[PDB]
Amino acid sequence: SHMEWYFGKLGRKDAERQLLSFGNPRGTFLIRESETTKGAYSLSIRDWDDMKGDHVKHYKIRKLDNGGYYITTRAQFETLQQLVQHYSERAAGLCCRLVVPCHK
Amino acid sequence: MEWYFGKLGRKDAERQLLSFGNPRGTFLIRESETTKGAYSLSIRDWDDMKGDHVKHYKIRKLDNGGYYITTRAQFETLQQLVQHYSERAAGLCCRLVVPCHK
């Protein structure tokens, strides 16, 4: 039972500044109270890519009724074909990678 | 294209996906009956408990064009949440690697 990642009442902007300080690697993270949704938490993560450089992504952690938590993501695509290609590469949130179209 | 099956019932889809020979990750997309104008992505999956089974995901039409899919992960505790994403990004921007320092 570690709770080193729990920061309690910390604001979104404040978590961003803390996370973006020198020496924190990609995938540095913390969990904090949600500022926008009472009773929910937020998972704030430091990430990096070629274009934006260091940035922070926040994910809402909501309460299941009858106990526990969940995270939701929405992935948008221009076309179904683009969705298929994407999830053929990595599972990224689906039960598994798309492998082959069902034969007819 | 060849993953599109049109007006295929949900149970029928499961039936086809669960056909002996199709590997884990065999998939198709079908028109929704429950939600007009939407599609469902049906995938053949497997685990230790259930064995071969099928998951369905709604693909809904965005206003002003394009499509979205929603994925969702559930946990008993924040503790197992953190452990799940330390192992695999699984939908997030990247894996959790280290708690921010105090």
Q: Which residues pair with B60 in a beta bridge?
A: B68
* Method in brief: X-ray
Give the residue carrying structure tokens 């590997």.
Answer: B23
For residue B4, the distance in angstroms to the closest alpha carbon of chain A comes to: 8
Best CA proximity match to B82, nearest among A52, A28, A13: A28
Q: What is the resolution of the experimental data for this entry, in Å?
A: 2.0
Distance between A13 CA and the closest CA of chain B, angstroms: 15
Across the interface, whether the CB atoms of B100 and A72 are under 8 A apart is answered no
Q: Do A99 and B62 touch (CB under 8 A)?
A: no
CB of A57 within 8 A of CB of A19?
Answer: no
- Domains in chain A, start-ordered, CATH in brackets? 1-104 (3.30.505.10)
- Largest Cα–Cα separation, chain B: 55
Which residues lie below 8 Å from residue B31, measured CB to CB, with a gap of 6+?
A: B6, B7, B8, B39, B40
Alpha-carbon distance of A71 to B93, in angstroms, equals 13
Amino acid at A81: Q
**Rounded Cα–Cα distance for residues A95 and B16 (Å):** 18
Q: Do A102 and B65 touch (CB under 8 A)?
A: no
Burial class (CB in 10 A: 0-12, 13-18, 19+), A102: buried
Which regions of B7-85 does DSSP assign to beta strands (E)?
26-31, 39-47, 51-61, 67-75
Residue A27 backbone class (left: φ over 0; alpha: ψ -120 to 50; beta: rest): left
